Symmetry: D2
Subunit: 253 residues, 4 copies
C-alpha cells in the first residue's frame, strides 16, 4: 500500500527481531526506511534484498558522532526524517544479589544512552515539520523480574526519557509525538536458538488453548504497534506507554 | 476498504462525538456496526443515513435485561459479535467539597455499571470465537480534575473492570482482548455551542502553533485508537490503558 | 503515650479488623477516637472497654443525614475533628463473566459512595483548622484479581476520590492531606472462619521463612500506616497511594 | 526516646539536606548512624559534633570497592547493618534537545549505579537478620520536568532497582524491605543560594495557606518518611513508591 508513502523512517537494531519486522511493515506501507545495525556485511545484503526504498547504515547507537552521521546520511538519501524507532538494545541477566555492576553499566550505555541521543537528534531532525519517535521498552520497566534487574532499570529510564522528550516537544510547539512500547517476551530466532533442547516453540509462546501462561509473542505482533505509532492515525498519543503484554498482570497469583 | 469486512461491532453512545466517529470509521473499513445512544431520536436519524450494514437499537445501558435483548437482536441481524465499544457515558460536574451525591450515583450507574454489564455480556458473546472489547475512559481516571471528581472515579472504576475482564479472558483461554482508552477533551458541536459567546474552536483545541495548552481534540483522533484496538493488528494488547492525552502530564508546571 | 494527645479522630467500620486496630493504636498515642459501625450493642461494649477517650456511634456510612449527625455528635463530645479514617467497606465476590450486577451495585454504594460522603464531610469539618483524611483501599485497586472484579473497581474509584479531594484541598488552600492505603489480604477471625478445614493462620499469613507466597497480613500492620498518616510527621504526603502489599508485584511468575 | 536503639544505619549524602536531617532523626531515636558525603570537611565536623553513635566515612558511591570498605568499616564499629538510606545523588540539568550526553552518563553513574551497588551490598549485610533499604528518588521519576530529563531517568531507574531488590528479598525469604521516596523540591542553602534576589524561603516553600503553588519542602519533612520506613512499624511496605509531592498532580491545569 501507499499508506505511509511520505514517511521516512530510521529503525535502529533493524537487521533482526522486532526491528526487522518493523522495517518490513513500514516498507510494505510504502515508507522509505533506513535501518541501522552493527554487522555491515549482513546489513548490506539485507538492504539489497529489501530494495531501493530501504537503506542500511552501520551504527554504534551509543556514539553521538555515529548518530550525527547516520541522521545526515539517511536524510540525504531518503529525505526529511519523520519516524524514528529506537529499537537497538541488549538483554543481559543479573539479579540484585549477584548481578555484575559491569553488566548494568553496559545495559545503561547501550539501552538508555542510545535513546537519549536518538531522541535528542530526532527532535532536531523533526522539529520543523513533525514526526513520531518510538522507544522500545519492556514490560519489565514496571513489572520486576528477578534476573533482569538492570535491564528493567535501563528500560524504566527509557520510559522517563520518552516522557521528557514528549513534554519538551509539546511545550516548544513541535508536532512530534514520543511514546514507548512495552512487550513481554519476543520469540525471535535468537530466543528459539537459546532454548534448552527439548523445549519447543509451543512450550514458550502464549496461546489461549495450549499455553495460557506463556510469556513470548511473535515479533510481528509487536511491530504492528510500532506501525500504528508511526502512522498519522495515532497522533493524539504522546508521552505514553503502550503495553504489549497480553494481560500478564494478575497472572500466576 | 474492506479491511474489517468480517467484523461485527456494537458501539454504545454511537450517535455523537467519539462514538459517532467510531461508527463511521468502522463502517468505512467494511464492518457491520450496530450502535445505541442515550439520545435515542438522534440515533434513529443517523441509522437512516448510514445504510444496510448499520443498525440502531434502543438501549438502557444500565439495564441487564435490555443488554440481553440488544446483544441478541444485533447478532440476529448482523452475525456473531467480535467488537464491543463501551462508549456510552455522561459527564456531570461536582467537586469534592460541594458536588452532589446524587450526581455521583448517576455517574456510577451510567458510566460504570454499563461497562460491567457490557463486558459480562460481551464475554458471553465472544468467548467461543474471540474479539475485542474497548472501554472508553478518560485522562481524568488518573489525572485529577477538581470539578469532575465523581466522573474521574467512575472512569477509574472502568479501568479496573477492564483489567479484571482481560485477566479472566486470559485465564479462561478466551481470545478476547479488553482495553481502555483515556482521552482528554473532545471537541464537538455541543462543546462549541457550550462555549461563552465569541469563543472559537481555536481557543479550546490543542494546536502546536496557536494553543499549546489546549485540552480539546477532534473526536476522529480518538476514534482511530478504537479502530486500532478493534483490528486484529492490535491483538497482543490486553488489560491496558491507551492514553490519548498528547503529553498533558507535566504541562502547566 | 501522649504523642497524639490533640488529635480527634473518627474511624468508620471501627469495631473490628483494621478499623479496630486503628482505634487501639490512636488511643494508645493519646488521641480521642470516635469509631462507628453497624452493631450498636457490641460497639457500646467495645467503647466501655476502650474507655472515656473513645466513643461509639451507630452509623450508616451511605447516608448524608447520618453523617451530619455523627460529625456533630462526635465533635460535641470529643472536640474539633482533625483525623478521618474512611475504613468502612464490604468485600463481596464476583468475576466479570458470572458476577452479579446487584452485588456490584452494593459494592459501589457501600465502598465508594461512603468515601465520597466522608470526604465531603471531612473537608467541611477541617477546612479552617486542618487535618488528615485517610481512605482505605486495596491492592486490588491496581492489581486485578479475577473473583473480586467489582470490589477492585470500587476501590479504584476510592483512589480517584482521594486524588480529587487532595487536589481540591491544595487548590483551595486548606491544610488538609488526603491519602489512600492499599493492603493485600487482612487476616482476621472472620477470614480464618471462612477458610477450609485445615488451612491455618500459618498457611495464609505471609512469613519470610514459613510462607513466602502468603497474601495475608495482621491488621495491626496496616493500622500502623494509618497511624503514620494521622500524625503530623507525615504532613508532606497528599494525593497518594500507600501500598501495603509487601512486594506482591512480580510474584507468581 | 530509644525507639530505634537496636538500629544501625548508613546514610549516603548525609552531610546536608535530607541526608543530614535523616541522620539527626535516626540519632534522636537512639540508633547508631554512619554517614558519608562528598563534603568531608563538613561531614567530619558533623560527626564530631553528633557524638559517639555517629561516624563519618569517605565514600565514592559509584565505586564497588569503596562500598565494600565502607560496609565493612561501618559494621566493625557500629554492628550489623539494618537500615540503609541511599540518598547520595546529583542534580545536573539538561533538557532532551540540548542536554549533554556526558552529564546524563554522570547522572546514571552517581544516581543509579550507586543504588545498584548499595542495594546489592545491603542485601548481603542484612539477609541473615533483616532490615530496611530506602532509596531516594524524586517526583520527577514519574512527572516529567523539561530541564531535568536525565535526572528523571536516573530516578526512574532507581525505582525499578527498588522493585527488583524488594522482589528478590521476598522470593529468597529475606526480611528486608526496599522502598523508594519521591519528593518534590528540597529547600537547602544550595537552592536558596541558587535563588535570585528577594526570592526567600517563603517564596519557594509550599505553604498550605500562604503559598499553595510552592514546590519546595524542608528536608526534615522528607526525612520523616525515611524514619517511618526505617522503623519496624512500616514493615508491610516493600517494593513501593512513597510519594512526597503533596498533591502536585493536577496543579497548574
Amino acid at each position: 500500500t501507499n499508506r505511509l508513502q511520505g514517511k521516512v523512517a530510521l529503525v535502529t537494531g533493524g537487521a533482526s527481531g522486532v526491528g526487522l519486522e518493523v522495517v518490513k511493515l513500514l516498507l510494505g506501507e510504502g515508507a522509505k526506511v533506513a535501518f541501522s545495525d552493527i554487522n555491515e556485511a549482513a546489513g548490506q545484503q539485507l538492504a539489497a534484498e529489501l530494495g531501493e526504498r530501504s537503506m542500511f547504515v552501520r551504527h554504534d547507537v551509543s556514539s553521538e558522532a555515529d548518530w550525527t552521521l547516520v541522521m545526515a546520511a539517511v536524510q540525504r538519501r531518503l529525505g526529511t526524517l519523520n519516524v524514528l524507532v529506537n529499537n537497538a538494545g541488549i538483554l543481559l541477566p543479573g539479579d540484585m544479589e549477584t548481578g555484575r555492576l559491569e553488566d548494568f553499566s553496559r545495559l545503561l550505555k547501550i539501552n538508555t544512552e542510545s535513546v537519549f541521543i536518538g531522541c535528542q537528534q530526532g527532535i532536531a531532525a523533526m522539529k520543523e515539520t513533525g514526526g513520531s519517535i518510538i522507544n522500545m521498552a519492556s514490560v519489565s520497566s514496571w513489572l520486576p523480574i528477578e534476573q533482569y534487574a538492570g535491564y528493567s532499570a535501563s528500560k524504566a529510564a527509557v520510559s522517563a526519557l520518552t516522557r521528557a522528550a514528549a513534554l519538551s516537544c509539546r511545550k516548544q510547539g513541535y508536532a512530534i509525538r514520543v511514546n514507548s512500547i512495552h512487550p513481554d517476551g519476543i520469540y525471535t530466532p535468537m530466543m528459539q536458538a537459546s532454548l534448552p533442547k527439548g523445549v519447543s516453540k509451543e512450550m514458550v509462546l502464549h496461546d489461549p488453548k495450549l499455553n495460557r501462561a506463556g510469556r513470548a509473542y511473535m515479533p510481528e505482533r509487536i511491530a504492528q504497534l510500532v506501525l500504528f505509532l508511526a502512522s498519522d492515525e495515532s497522533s493524539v498519543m504522546s508521552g505514553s506507554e503502550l503495553h504489549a503484554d497480553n494481560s500478564i498482570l494478575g497472572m500466576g497469583l
